[PDB]
Ligand binder design. Structure first.
Ligand SMILES: *C(=N)CNC(=O)C1(NC(=O)c2ccc(Cl)cc2N)CCCCC1
Ligand SMILES: [Cl-]
Ligand SMILES: [K+]
Length: 215
């Protein structure tokens, strides 16, 4: 795999979104990974519907939380996911309003990265595109990130509580990193992004629950 890659530069990544008060990070993570695959497959990028996911993925708990893999499976079995335009984000769990004729993407399943394996995560990012990941995002030091490569030893890689999207990886002043898209809006972190430590013993659990959709 290459030393560095940044899918934002290849047009695979939509603007940073803001999930608001709803615990729908899983839906944003999911749609980000689906948006990458859409671009790679069709050459066109479009915002996909996180609300579609929050409302219709019955095996998840809406604004209470969810798994990305459940969302991919939903899209696969549903034969589609709506665009954000067709099914806008409202930030509370409502009745399912999916319309097949507003579908903007499909999914033929999903693959999971071997647990803890940052080298396999690197290879997935390099070869696939953006990958959904879960992390411990509970620390004040994460919440108030502004610059640099984030590393805090008190992060608990076994305490996953947030889902985000790995859109690349690189190195900054010998500190290898992952390029992470959050869903806390553009006024969070560095215009909505955080550089997280790569190859520092799976810092924050970055490679513990990674997956991507197949299209
Ligand atoms: C995002 N704002 C909150 N975090 C999550 O949703 C994560 N999943 C869960 O908390 C979770 C998963 C599955 C069910 Cl059915 C219910 C819940 N609450 C945090 C763990 C990592 C993946 C996302
Ligand atoms: Cl419903
Ligand atoms: K990390």
């Amino acid at each position: 795999a290459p030393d560095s890659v940044d899918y934002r530069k290849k047009g695979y990544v939509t603007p940073v979104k803001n999930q608001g008060q709803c615990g729908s990070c899983w839906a944003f993570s999911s749609v980000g990974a689906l948006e990458g695959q859409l671009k790679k497959k069709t050459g066109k990028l479009l915002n996909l519907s996180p609300q579609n996911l929050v409302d219709c993925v019955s095996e998840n708990d809406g604004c209470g939380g969810g798994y990305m893999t459940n969302a991919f499976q939903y899209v696969q079995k549903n034969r589609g996911i709506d665009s954000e335009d067709a099914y806008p984000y409202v930030g509370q769990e409502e009745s399912c309003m999916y319309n097949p004729t507003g579908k903007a993407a499909k999914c033929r399943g999903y693959r999971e990265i071997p647990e803890g394996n940052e080298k396999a995560l690197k290879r997935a990012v390099a070869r696939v595109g953006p990958v959904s990941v879960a992390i411990d995002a509970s620390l004040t030091s994460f919440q108030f990130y502004s610059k640099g490569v984030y590393y805090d030893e008190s992060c608990n890689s076994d305490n996953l509580n947030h889902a985000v999207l790995a859109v690349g990886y690189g190195i900054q002043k010998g500190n290898k990193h992952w390029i992470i898209k959050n869903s806390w809006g553009e006024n969070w972190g560095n215009k909505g992004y955080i550089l997280m430590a790569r190859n520092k013993n799976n810092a924050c659990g970055i490679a513990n629950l990674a997956s991507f959709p197949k299209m």
